[PDB]
Design a protein. Structure first.
Ligand SMILES: CCCCCCCCCCCCO[C@@H]1O[C@H](CO)[C@@H](O[C@H]2O[C@H](CO)[C@@H](O)[C@H](O)[C@H]2O)[C@H](O)[C@H]1O
Ligand SMILES: CCCCCCCCCCCCO[C@@H]1O[C@H](CO)[C@@H](O[C@H]2O[C@H](CO)[C@@H](O)[C@H](O)[C@H]2O)[C@H](O)[C@H]1O
Ligand SMILES: *CCS(=O)(=O)N1CN(S(=O)(=O)CC*)CN(S(=O)(=O)CC*)C1
Ligand SMILES: CCCCCCCCCCCCCCCC(=O)O
Lengths: 151, 15, 563
């Protein structure tokens, strides 16, 4: 009913070779972004390479917040909401610098009797949010290409 | 600008 | 720098907990990288001055904050606890985070209090009355591009005196290794060694060693993707101090346990596109079907105590997660297929404006861990058991709504749901409505029994919240919040904040009424009122804001931006 298979790559053709740059290259967000780019067939270069006209992806601040979303009748936390905010930017060398962001929402219930267990759960959730924050950023790459053509 | 076209749309319904 | 070190402007507040309180802060500039603050905080009801000492530092290893509050004596605590020899009340907090040389990662998140009721009595700067426990984590890691090894210790100080027993990892070692171009496959190895100790001397102690190699084959197209993955899990348990539990439980814990299990996962995704010219010129819709088959054999794990495994929430993202529990003490058997679909909307500028997802989990066989103490509302074991839906609509630049819903046929009711609609013109002009739900059946299933029997827990969650923020004349900023529990038809938290900002100073006045505790002598809730007055000097820094976001985070249910 009008549907057709996607005939265009998720990553725009001009971004098939790019440089991934960050202040924490061995961190978890950088690993997630590099893995996502590798899954899309993107050739990642070192920032010291001599190839020019290669767009750069500079990852920036990452903020993780844990807040109380709801409370029980005694005022104790029932549900925790975790927020991941990622700010990145894409430098197209001739043209311009375009900033992009990602925000990920997750929730989980508390259990003081199994605090250790809950902590592990929290860790796992964080490991997921990074991945959720990576696909979000790649999904904004076609928007940058469209903005590049417009200007 | 019919937003409810998201869950139901068919090309030959239009024309 | 004696020029930059001196007394700050005293602030004050009236609380129902401590009557009139008075702070007399003193700032001290030790160095350009290390600064300190000393605050005598006089509480009238307790009739004493408690000393707050705060210390911020920036070093090569990272940035950190230490804080130490000490109260030599307390009249209220002495009255409530006549038997105790001393009524001193102290708090120690330390938060350090850093990455040195891009390879070393140092993390400290440590909180210790003298008594469980500390945060119900004193203000919430590095803690809250909403917390059920205090966390004490140390972690040192070494991470390079294809490797990382982290050694960490986690301890918890539980507040509620129902069962203060809590397990600790002393220490925990995590090792990850990655390879990416071994033929067409990707490979990784995850190893862990942990030692669980307990606060009580009669509970089992354990040493766990876990190895987990995974190998996966990804295949990708412009329109489709399929990833196959074979994982192997080998765990060894050495448990000691089992006389008490074995003498009192019918199932027997074993000293040496070996748990070996394969795991097979097949994930597939497709993308379809279509042109939606009726919405607006250039808009497109994308349909994204996703399926995943998961198979994990069944191993009876009744001889292993559950140290760190807890039930995982299943949102739409968690539908495709390959684990039922966290940790490694309970690996549920699986023979299941997850099917979901996501629809996305883009404009002419290829910007996501709307997305909606729905999915379900179909179980071919019942998921068993060898032990199954979860209290379900019916005996459903196989079939379409879990449903999850998510939506996010960016209605305009200043509007946006989010929603999520979880359904479990074993609960015979919606497990949890949440929604929120927010208008935000700017960081000062905003309005937000939100709702949170959690059925009593869900609380019964996923939480201990006394939660199901206790009045303050058994009714679940049904909470409506409203947050508003509006400036006047670029100098004033009014902020308000109200949270209401429809189950009990009672207030949970309300806040009011007025700030007058000028060129050289800012004056903030805040009021808050919050759920502060539970009184079981006649079984009601206990509220706390706090009205505060604070002045801070401007001009010395570059901050010129109206302070709206600061007061929006001052209550026990802080505001969060949802576009
Ligand atoms: C709560 C459960 C889920 C509810 C489901 C509701 C689904 C609604 C999907 C809406 C999809 C996007 O909705 C679309 O928004 C855009 C952006 O404003 C509107 O577009 C409007 O503004 C744009 C941008 O200025 C103009 O170019 C356009 O002429 C005008 O119509 C479309 O007319 C509407 O179709
Ligand atoms: C399919 C994609 C979905 C996109 C996201 C949709 C988000 C939907 C948000 C729902 C928000 C309202 O949340 C809804 O609150 C009502 C009212 O308490 C709960 O409904 C409740 O009503 C009464 C108790 O009050 C009971 O009789 C009923 O059994 C119980 O479910 C719903 O279980 C919960 O879903
Ligand atoms: C929701 C769109 S529809 O049901 O498929 N629909 C078909 N047309 S159309 O939208 O004009 C297709 C170009 C006629 N209508 S409508 O009144 O125009 C929907 C707003 C129904
Ligand atoms: C869920 C699976 C969706 C499959 C979409 C098929 C698209 C082609 C048929 C409809 C048009 O015509």
């Amino acid at each position: 009913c009008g549907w057709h298979l996607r005939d265009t790559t998720q990553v725009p053709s001009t971004m098939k070779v790019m440089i991934l740059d960050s202040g924490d290259p061995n961190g978890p967000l950088s690993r997630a972004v590099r893995n996502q780019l590798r899954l899309n067939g993107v050739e990642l270069l070192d920032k010291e390479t001599t190839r020019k006209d290669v767009p750069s992806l500079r990852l920036g601040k990452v903020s993780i917040a844990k807040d109380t979303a709801s409370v029980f009748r005694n005022g104790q936390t029932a549900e925790y909401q975790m927020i991941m905010t990622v700010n990145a930017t894409v430098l197209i060398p001739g043209r311009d610098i375009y900033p992009i962001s990602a925000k990920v929402f997750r929730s989980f219930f508390d259990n003081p009797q199994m605090a250790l267990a809950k902590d592990n759960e929290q860790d796992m959730i964080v490991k997921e949010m990074y991945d959720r924050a990576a696909e979000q950023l790649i999904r904004k790459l076609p928007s940058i290409r469209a903005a590049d053509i417009r200007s | 600008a019919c937003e409810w076209c998201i869950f139901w749309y068919d090309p030959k319904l239009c024309a | 720098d004696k020029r930059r070190s001196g007394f700050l402007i005293p602030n004050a507040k009236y609380t129902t907990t401590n009557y009139f309180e008075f702070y007399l802060p003193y700032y001290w500039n030790i160095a350009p990288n290390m600064d300190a603050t000393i605050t005598p905080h006089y509480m009238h009801r307790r009739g004493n001055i408690m000393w707050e000492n705060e210390f911020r530092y920036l070093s090569q290893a990272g940035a950190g904050l230490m804080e130490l509050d000490y109260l030599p004596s307390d009249k209220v605590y002495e009255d409530e606890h006549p038997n105790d020899d001393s009524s001193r009340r102290w708090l120690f907090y330390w938060n350090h985070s850093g990455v040195m040389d891009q390879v070393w990662r140092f993390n400290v998140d440590y909180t210790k209090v003298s008594d469980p009721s500390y945060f119900n009595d004193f203000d919430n700067k590095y803690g809250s009355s909403t917390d059920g426990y205090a966390t004490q984590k140390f972690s040192v890691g070494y991470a390079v591009q294809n490797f990382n090894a982290t050694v960490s210790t986690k301890q918890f100080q539980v507040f509620s005196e129902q069962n203060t027993s809590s397990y600790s990892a002393e220490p925990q070692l995590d090792v990850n290794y990655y390879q990416n171009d071994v033929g067409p496959f990707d490979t990784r190895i995850y190893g862990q060694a942990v030692h669980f100790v307990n606060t009580r001397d009669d509970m089992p102690e354990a040493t766990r060693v876990h190895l987990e190699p995974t190998i996966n084959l990804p295949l990708s197209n412009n329109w489709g993707s399929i990833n196959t993955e074979a994982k192997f899990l080998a765990t060894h348990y050495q448990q000691t101090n089992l006389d008490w539990y074995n003498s009192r439980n019918t199932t027997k814990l074993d000293e040496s346990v070996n748990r070996v299990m394969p795991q097979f996962k097949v994930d597939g995704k497709m993308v379809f596109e279509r042109d939606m010219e009726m919405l607006a010129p250039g808009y497109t819709q994308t349909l994204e079907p996703r399926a995943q088959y998961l198979y994990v054999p069944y191993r009876d794990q009744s001889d292993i105590y559950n140290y760190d495994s807890s039930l995982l929430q299943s949102d739409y993202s968690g539908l495709f997660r390959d684990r039922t529990y966290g940790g490694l003490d309970r690996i549920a058997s699986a023979n299941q297929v997850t099917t979901g679909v996501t629809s996305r909307i883009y404009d002419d500028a290829a910007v996501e404006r709307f997305n909606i997802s729905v999915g379900q989990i179909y179980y071919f066989t019942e998921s068993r861990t060898g032990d199954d103490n979860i209290t379900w509302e019916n005996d459903d074991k196989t079939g379409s058991l879990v449903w999850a839906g998510d939506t996010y609509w960016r209605i305009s630049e200043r509007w946006g709504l989010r929603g999520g819903i979880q359904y479990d046929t074993r609960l015979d009711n919606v497990a949890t749901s949440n929604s929120s609609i927010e208008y935000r013109r700017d960081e000062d002009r905003l309005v937000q409505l939100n709702y949170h739900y959690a059925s009593p059946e869900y609380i019964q299933a996923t939480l201990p029994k006394y939660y199901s029997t206790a009045e303050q827990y058994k009714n679940g969650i049904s909470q409506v919240g409203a947050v508003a923020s509006r400036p006047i004349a670029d100098r004033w900023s009014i902020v308000g919040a109200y949270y209401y529990d429809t189950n009990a038809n009672k207030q949970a938290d309300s806040m009011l904040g007025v700030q007058y900002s000028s060129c050289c100073y800012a004056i903030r006045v805040g009021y808050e009424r919050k759920l502060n505790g539970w009184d079981n002598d006649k079984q009601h809730a206990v509220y706390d009122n706090a009205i505060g007055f604070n002045i801070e000097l401007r001009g010395l820094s570059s901050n010129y804001g109206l302070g709206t976001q600061e007061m929006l985070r001052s209550n026990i249910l802080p505001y969060q931006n949802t576009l």
